């Protein structure tokens, strides 16, 4: 019962605060910036910071962290969550990248069979079947929520909105329940 927050970008603190607010003694949250922390936790949530920053900071010492995460999701199949930029990194295909980077399709971690376009803020009521601070728009493709709002495929969860920016912590418990179910 140990979930981690990838603390190489911004927005990790609100994610940690709202996970702790649920007030469960068994649940412990630690920062994740290296492979050691990645192996310590049984789950992982990618805070909705920058997408470029996360990928560059995940390519230190010949993709040491990037390979750890990619192997982590695609082999151990442990629960993972991605908000805002998290969805961008969790989508196999992402476009609207004018610069011809050599990364190609390995820029995104993958896991969700969806096509996303990052390219502004408002509030939307979640008609589950949310403060969208520059929420990416999904172009191509079970949908957990819609207003599409949340997509959960296998152990991977994706939310284009920022639940941690609102008082309610329902989604934080939802991923904790997902982690407990996997455990």
């Amino acid at each position: 019962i140990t979930i981690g927050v990838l603390s190489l970008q911004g927005d990790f603190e609100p994610h940690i605060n709202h996970f702790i607010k649920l007030q469960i003694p068994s649940l412990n949250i630690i920062q994740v910036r290296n492979v050691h922390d990645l192996g310590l936790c049984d789950g992982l949530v990618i805070p909705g910071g920058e997408s470029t920053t996360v990928r560059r900071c995940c390519a230190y010492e010949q993709d040491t962290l990037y390979n750890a995460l990619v192997h982590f999701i695609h082999v151990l199949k442990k629960p993972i969550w991605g908000t805002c930029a998290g969805c961008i990194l969790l989508s196999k295909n992402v476009e609207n990248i004018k610069l011809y980077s050599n990364f190609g399709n390995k820029f995104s971690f993958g896991g969700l069979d969806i096509t996303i376009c990052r390219n502004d803020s408002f509030i939307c009521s979640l008609n589950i079947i949310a403060a969208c601070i520059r929420a990416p728009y999904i172009r191509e493709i079970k949908v957990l929520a819609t207003f599409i709002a949340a997509v959960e495929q296998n152990n991977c969860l994706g939310t284009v909105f920022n639940p941690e920016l609102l008082p309610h912590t329902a989604f934080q418990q939802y991923f904790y329940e997902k982690v407990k179910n996997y455990k």
């Binding site: 190489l8 911004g10 910036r33 290296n34 920058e50 900071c57 805002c84 803020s121 520059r134 920022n162």
Partner: protein
């Protein structure tokens, strides 16, 4: 203003590189910066020409910031019409209104403003600043002032948190800050808005020292590009801020820096 704060809170733990052109802005995007502050490519210093800011804004997918003189509320109106990501009411540029500061409540674009103590930081947050940065000493490369101001603000906030209810009213008068924010700082135990470090950060060690002192990010000047390897030094300061608590990584990025 809540959405501006939420957007800024997503801005924590990053590096903002003060770029001067499109090639520099591209370097800072590959290096992993979260935003680029558009500068004047080489007296009275005025806001950069909006055609230059608009050039960079379409060549980088990361945030773009711009500088407006202290009090010049019509340069800000020009930039806000440009759909920029965040405006910096800066003291590096010549002061337009030495007595007043833009009324940042009238703009939809978040503002970042300097600060040398908690009283000054709380005043600017009252006026509507969505972010703060320690003034330091721009153009010198000396982290003496940035560290001095970081400690001063950090000490005052904690000393405040250790005070009592009846003593808060005098403290607000002492630092000359609105009482509402002074209580908000007491409750949160930190500055109510995102706080970055600016002025003097030139080395991966300097960036990590500021982060180890509490700040949420770093503002790095143009020294990164006036060096032997701009791309490598830039990615070094980015990794330092991302891994500011890892001495092994800090050593690794500091080796062969030039």
């Amino acid at each position: 203003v809540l959405l501006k704060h939420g957007w800024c809170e997503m801005l924590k733990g990053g590096v903002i590189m003060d770029v001067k052109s499109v090639e520099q802005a591209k370097i800072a995007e590959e290096a992993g910066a979260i935003g680029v502050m558009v500068l004047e490519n080489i007296g009275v210093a005025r806001s950069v020409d909006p055609s230059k800011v608009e050039e960079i804004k379409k060549c980088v997918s990361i945030n773009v910031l711009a500088r407006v003189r202290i009090g010049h509320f019509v340069e800000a109106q020009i930039l806000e019409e440009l759909k920029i990501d965040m405006i910096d009411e800066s003291e590096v540029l010549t002061i337009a209104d030495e007595m007043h500061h833009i009324d940042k409540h009238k703009f939809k674009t978040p503002f970042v403003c300097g600060c040398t103590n908690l009283g000054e930081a709380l005043r600017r947050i009252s006026e509507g600043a969505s972010m703060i940065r320690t003034k330091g000493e721009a153009g010198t490369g000396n982290i003496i002032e940035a560290i001095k101001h970081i400690r001063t603000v950090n000490n005052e906030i904690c000393y405040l948190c250790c005070l009592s209810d009846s003593e808060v009213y005098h403290f607000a008068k002492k630092i000359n800050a609105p009482i509402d924010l002074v209580l908000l700082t007491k409750k949160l135990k930190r500055l109510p808005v995102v706080n970055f470090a600016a002025g003097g950060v030139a080395t991966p060690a300097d960036a990590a020292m500021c982060m180890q002192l509490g700040m949420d990010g770093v503002f790095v000047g143009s020294g990164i590009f006036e060096s032997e390897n701009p791309r490598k030094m830039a990615a070094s300061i980015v990794s330092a801020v991302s891994n500011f608590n890892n001495p092994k990584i800090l050593l690794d990025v500091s080796m062969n820096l030039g």
